[PDB]
Design a protein around this ligand. Sequence first.
Ligand SMILES: O=C(O)c1cc2sccc2[nH]1
Ligand SMILES: [Mg+2]
Ligand SMILES: [Mg+2]
Length: 711
Amino acid sequence: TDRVSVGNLRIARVLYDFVNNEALPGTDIDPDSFWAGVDKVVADLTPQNQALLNARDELQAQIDKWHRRRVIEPIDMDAYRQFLTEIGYLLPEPDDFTITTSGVDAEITTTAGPQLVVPVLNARFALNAANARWGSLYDALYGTDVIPETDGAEKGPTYNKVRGDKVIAYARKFLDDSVPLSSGSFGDATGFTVQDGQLVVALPDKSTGLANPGQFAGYTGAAESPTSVLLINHGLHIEILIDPESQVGTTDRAGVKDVILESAITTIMDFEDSVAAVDAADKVLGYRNWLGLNKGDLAARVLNRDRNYTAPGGGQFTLPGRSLMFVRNVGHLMTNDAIVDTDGSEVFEGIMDALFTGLIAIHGLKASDINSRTGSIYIVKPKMHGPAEVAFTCELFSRVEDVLGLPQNTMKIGIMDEERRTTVNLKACIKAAADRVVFINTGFLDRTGDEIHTSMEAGPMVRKGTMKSQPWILAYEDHNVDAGLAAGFSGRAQVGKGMWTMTELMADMVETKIAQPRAGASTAWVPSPTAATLHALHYHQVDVAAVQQGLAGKRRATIEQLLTIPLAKELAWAPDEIREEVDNNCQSILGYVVRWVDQGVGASKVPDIHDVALMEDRATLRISSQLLANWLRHGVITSADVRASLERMAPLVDRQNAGDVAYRPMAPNFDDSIAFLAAQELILSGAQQPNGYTEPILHRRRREFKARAAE
Ligand SMILES: O=C(O)c1cc2sccc2[nH]1
Ligand SMILES: [Mg+2]
Ligand SMILES: [Mg+2]
């Protein structure tokens, strides 16, 4: 064996070395006592962890039988509801309360705007993310399909000025909508000056100020001839870079080189569904990146420093130039062999994540010879089921704080709302974290995986595409905003919404995603720094703080709508529609699995069945597999169907990775591909996985590949 014995634990050496040599130095935490903390916290909390997982299995078991004992269709929702209360699945709502969480940064309590999520195992992507707090609107507009390439404005090897002018025009118009001049348009501006503390803008036959001078917030250079001008609207910053000597500024009517938008206000470094990390070596690669981010010395190429400005009244000030970080730890399910037992039992990965990522974050609270200036650590806990599992997270963070010698309530929690048992008890869930909570958040994929698994025995479900528009999910989206607002989230915590997955479809993002801030969402997920810039446009257009005031007190969702199961209408599909959906789901699984098992990639630009590039995480494996498994259970399709579909889609996936040197085809040797067998196992063993979770099968298969590669 290759482990370091500490109490009842056998720590993997790679881990042991990393914590001692890299992580602990600077934290003034005694390496001896730290490892004692670990062995003690693990031993003390592991049974509670295991009891929760057991309880998930008990409830599901009762719901399984219940559905199998229904003669009368359609489902009596009154009985169904009372059964859930009986078995303690549906708990009574607590009285109104207001969260009490202190020491939270302004990016979270106050500022509405984009929030970026990125695989922590990718230093470059993670580097770009932390620096994505500020980004160029011009590069984003020119680089993407927001500005059409319709004849004249196509992207070429060389810079296209027809295109550049439309980019300019777009930004000129954005200025008009966001920070309006009393008279005239930014489009005709010829210069910018600052006299007596007010911003004057040069116009052809006049000059004006802002309609609200308040929106002027600073500048750089000399007041007579500024190198930039800093505007604020809706708490978000806009910078107009003025440089008549630049290529763009030369042919610009006011000498403007660019417009810079405060984009990714916060960022989530992810240890969960966007990364593949199945052993001790994978975990330390992850932890090491998190360390470099927190010490501030990650480099491939560095982390930006803050920005300097002159106050409107000729003073001096500063704005942060990094995107405030969260970290997402893994949920309650998995164990990982980075630490094993004396009998060989793996130690729970969630517990490990709280200890290590929390240890590491201490560096981010002190001068990089920097992060939460108010003294907090931000962890996003995924895949929780119900308030009891939330209280368990508190106690974990409590103990870890003691081990690390941190003040209590230092380790804040963002509660993901992505499991059905959490949704319908959301108010209780927040109350259980009332003094630590900084964040709620909804999303399609995981929540829909759980929806389908929980009602597996009820009957055939609707196609994946139909789920977005089903009653349960609309109620869920609204119910989350309400429970957040009612618990006092406005001004105190983020209410968030899900990811835009179509990375090349930015015009479409720019028209569609605006509904999220309009839905009252203080923040929402974007897959890149570019998209974070474009999504920033939405918070300039929507006054989220006002939308939230207006929603306050409304109960827009009822428990009946939440509990409305997405059953399919009897004989709803034509045989070709069934085939299209099977082929679609098998392609989604195959497309994501092959990269996961063969290459340890947890998120990437995966072409779908129609060659649209989706940037999904592992949750897309849960929904897709649970759905085919559902359809299997109820005889919507056969096993001959599933196999035939997988065998057709694998060559297709193969070609979609034609440009990848490292790629191993799955065709034609299907049963010899670990990736192919994994895709197949997820589907055929799907009904039996706890809550449809894909980690057990996936992790095992990636570890199987690692071993064949070890030869
Ligand atoms: O589809 C999603 O929910 C998703 C895609 C990516 S990439 C990093 C997180 C994340 N989440
Ligand atoms: Mg998820
Ligand atoms: Mg407004």
